[PDB]
Design a protein around this nucleic acid. Structure first.
Length: 192
DNA sequence: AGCCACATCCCGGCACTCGAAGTCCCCAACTTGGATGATTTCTTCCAGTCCTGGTAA
């Protein structure tokens, strides 16, 4: 699978597992963690399985060991040493005022508080063209979208069941639900 | 190899600095020569009383 220019790190990895047929939990644990362990023990010890936990700004001190795991993937998938690292969210070296935590992604630093940790929404009008969870949704200051007739990002309660893509890793549909093919200022607010 | 209890750990939060002039440095402190003789040191009288044995002829 090739990465998209605007793709989240977790989206790419989910697609990769699935592309190789590693659809189930047990093989997700396996095709990921056990292979890493058998390369070297450190690539696995630094690598918890749950998806939310995988990104750097969720991590503690042993980041370099997690990076080594990214580097093993870079070899396995015929990559480049920074192909994935250009996508990851890391600890900024810049305080952003009053000792706040701030998070750095290839040139843009966004304060910790604007990261939309829970209830990621989606836009069916773009998902039907290329189905992968995209970046710029994880931002708190971002409702609606550019293009697509505007309107609202279709929000978490799709059908009497809260949605996201991390506690339940499907893109087109989630849990009990279906394939989701379901006021004129926010399109300016959208430009983050 | 998978599941569960318990350790800590770091960010967001909170509170403090705290009134409000300075008061001199340094180096030296004395040598010598002698301390007196001649005499004497008290005497009279007195120094309480009564209670509180065991054992055998």
């Amino acid at each position: 699978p090739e990465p998209f220019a605007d793709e989240a790190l977790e989206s790419y990895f989910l697609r990769l597992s699935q592309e190789n047929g590693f659809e189930r939990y047990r093989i997700f644990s396996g095709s990921v963690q056990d292979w890493l362990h058998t390369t070297d023990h450190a690539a696995a010890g630094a690598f918890p399985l749950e998806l939310s936990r995988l990104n750097i700004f969720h991590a503690s001190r042993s980041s370099g060991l997690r990076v080594r795991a990214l580097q093993l993937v870079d070899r396995l998938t015929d990559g480049a040493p920074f192909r994935l690292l250009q996508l990851a969210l890391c600890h900024s070296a810049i305080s952003f005022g009053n000792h706040y935590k701030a998070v750095h992604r290839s040139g843009v630093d966004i304060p910790l508080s604007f990261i939309r940790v829970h209830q990621i929404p989606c836009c069916p009008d773009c998902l039907r063209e290329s189905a992968y969870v995209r970046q710029c949704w994880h931002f708190k200051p971002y409702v609606g979208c550019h293009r697509h007739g505007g309107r609202l990002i279709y929000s978490c309660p799709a059908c009497g069941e809260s949605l996201n893509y991390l506690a339940s890793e499907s893109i087109n549909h989630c849990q009990c639900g279906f394939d989701l093919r379901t006021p004129d200022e926010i399109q300016l607010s959208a430009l983050a």
